[PDB]
Design a protein around this ligand. Sequence first.
Ligand SMILES: Cc1ccncc1NC(=O)Cc1cccc(Br)c1
Ligand SMILES: Cc1ccncc1NC(=O)Cc1cccc(Br)c1
Lengths: 304, 304
Amino acid sequence: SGFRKMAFPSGKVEGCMVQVTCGTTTLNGLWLDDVVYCPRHVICTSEDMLNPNYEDLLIRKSNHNFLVQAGNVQLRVIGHSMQNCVLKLKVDTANPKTPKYKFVRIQPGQTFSVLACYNGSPSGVYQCAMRPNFTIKGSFLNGSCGSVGFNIDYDCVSFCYMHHMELPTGVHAGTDLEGNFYGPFVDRQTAQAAGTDTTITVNVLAWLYAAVINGDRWFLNRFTTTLNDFNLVAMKYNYEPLTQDHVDILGPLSAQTGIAVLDMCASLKELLQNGMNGRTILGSALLEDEFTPFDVVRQCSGVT
Amino acid sequence: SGFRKMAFPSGKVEGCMVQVTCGTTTLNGLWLDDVVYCPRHVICTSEDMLNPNYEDLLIRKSNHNFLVQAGNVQLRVIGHSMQNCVLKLKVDTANPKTPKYKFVRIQPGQTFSVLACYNGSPSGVYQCAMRPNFTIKGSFLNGSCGSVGFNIDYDCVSFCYMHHMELPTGVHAGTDLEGNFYGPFVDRQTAQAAGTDTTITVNVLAWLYAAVINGDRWFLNRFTTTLNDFNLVAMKYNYEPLTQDHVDILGPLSAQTGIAVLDMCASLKELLQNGMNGRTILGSALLEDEFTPFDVVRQCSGVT
Ligand SMILES: Cc1ccncc1NC(=O)Cc1cccc(Br)c1
Ligand SMILES: Cc1ccncc1NC(=O)Cc1cccc(Br)c1
């Protein structure tokens, strides 16, 4: 029992972190096999970031300008290329600590762990969700660029995020491991609109199921609702509309607790319309949307 | 910017986890140098747990009864001893992945990361506080016993907790790495009173400082208070009385923000007396007490 915002064990990812320096800029790189991946803005000075011409800035750089240090040791760079917003530095040595890995583009509303790093050194690990508007509300400071987000399925690390930027609003933006930004962002020091965000309804329902499993049940009521009725309330409260695909992924939690998904929707409806009345659910005084149904099952069954 | 409940990177601790089996019971062990530490209740059956005579139960066990497996490989047990509520199994091989480490007994109100494990395999990492009543509100299931809590100071892991038990209230109890329980608990299947808990005042103030640093400042007011006046409010709201030692550790945060500690106390006083009025601070709708002043400084400066 108990339910926490749990991150994946970060060890497999710590073994891949390196520091990449190009000129006066230092950030984090991810060393997998014989390639180091890092944000392409490592080639910019502060002056360049207002409107960088990355193709031109990269043409002035040679393999020997990219200083890659794996803690104690220096890596020899034998190739460089830009793919979207990431640089790929081919090194002459495959990382001996490379775990089994995949590069995946996650969907908005999915969660992942972030290993925040500075100068190629891991500082901390936290779990977060990719917001429906493709931003993440992380904890990142200058030098954290190149820190990665990931999930783990037994021995396989699926890398889904590389940190690039903090928006003027204090929220975070980055790319998949092929250098494609999540959302409409560009790697430039320009104010950029993040879309209207929404609350991840299916995650809130999964978390209400986690609450019932762990003994917090005051919010259960004698009511039920329909997808249509629930979606009118979801609309009013800026929640994602619930679909049958979301109901389907909540099936295991509905089966484990015996609480039909639409009955849990009626509890969520009442919580939206009435608030918490000064009470808490799993130590929170608000509706939590950073746990997916898979996260709740994994945490509630003890998956390693 | 941004502020998250960040755990330490767990890699150094993942390399120490092993599975320990004695008869029909399997739990986690911590392998450091040539010793494996685990909860002594690994020697009990379910029948034994109602009132175990650990000295007698351990006398029926030999070195060969303790099956220790470090993932793939079996460790050869050449000695066993009980120290308080932990067993120490001497193995013939020093763990090659042993990090620089210390065993420390943490104070109530201090925080640490937990690497939750099952069958010697890490499942997740989360940050938590040792409650003033010496319980922890973790996320643990059957098989998690032997999972450890720790802090890291550059390359040194200070192990402070080993999980033993879930109280009938769903909260967690365990020991330091010398097998001494935190709090009044005993390793027996008996209902046990955890003391009256309190909110960790110095941590809430540190978190209010983290909020101001990260832009959440609506709660700042035109008031100040005294330690005596603040402590009357702390008393009413079941918060730990604030002392000069707590004011002193908040000095760096007071200096960084220019907000005197007693002025932050007056904001906390108003929040206690009025609530949040439906607003949030750092994404929370309640007053958070799981960040120490050191945690806030570390997170807000980017320490690796
Ligand atoms: C200072 C900071 C804090 C947190 N995360 C990231 C940062 N750094 C930046 O945002 C630098 C930067 C500026 C403009 C475009 C790009 Br791409 C990168
Ligand atoms: C089932 C579970 C869940 C979470 N953490 C721990 C557990 N396991 C236990 O508490 C088993 C146990 C029973 C009585 C005394 C002692 Br010492 C240990």
